[PDB]
């Protein structure tokens, strides 16, 4: 087909290819941030007056600021 | 044919040829401006008070001012 046609088709083709490629990149960058909490040490402490409190040690697995909902 | 005829025919022929040639040029110049958006980084952010906002990085593919319709 005429070079005009190859011009049009290559333009649209390149736009679509770049879009999909950097879509893959962004999906990878979002999947790499999957995170979660893990505990390495926990011993509930109790005082003489009845006050209790948990003294735990956390380590965030991943690269993010995990949000604690409830204990 | 008589040079009168060749004069007439070459005039009309040259007009038509120039018209079609610069038609091809203008079609190429219009096809070269095919454009589109592409994203390279996107991470939705959320505040403590519930306000959310997307912080994306855009790069226009092509040579034009793309118009965003909806997200």
Author numbering:
A (entry chain F), B (entry chain T): 1 to 71
Sentences from the paper on this structure:
In contrast, the sequence identity between the pilins from P. arsenaticum and S. solfataricus is only ~18%. In contrast, ~10% of the residues in P. arsenaticum pilin are charged. Interestingly, and in contrast to the S. islandicus and S. solfataricus pilins, P. arsenaticum pilin has a 15 amino acid C-terminal extension that wraps around the globular domain. Within this extension, an intramolecular disulfide bond is formed between Cys139 in the extension and Cys80 within the same pilin chain, which is likely to contribute to the thermo-stability of this pilus. In S. solfataricus, we see clear extra density consistent with glycosylation on seven residues, all serines or threonines. In contrast, in P. arsenaticum only a single density consistent with glycosylation is seen, on Asn55, which would be N-linked glycosylation. First, although T4P of a neutrophilic P. arsenaticum is as hydrophobic as those of acidophilic S. islandicus and S. solfataricus, it does not possess the extensive sugar coating. Instead, T4P of P. arsenaticum is stabilized by an intramolecular disulfide bond, a protein adaptation to high temperatures previously reported in bacteria, archaea and their viruses. Consistent with this prediction, boiling the S. islandicus pili in 5 M GuHCl failed to disassemble the filaments, but under the same conditions the P. arsenaticum pili come apart. Interestingly, Iho670 adhesion filament packs very similarly to S. solfataricus and S. islandicus pili, with an RMSD < 2 Å, while P. arsenaticum packs slightly differently from those three filaments with RMSDs of 3–4 Å. Notably, the crucial N-terminal subunit-subunit interactions in these four filaments are almost all hydrophobic, except for in P. arsenaticum there is a glutamic acid, which may contribute to the slightly different packing compared to Iho670 and other archaeal T4P.
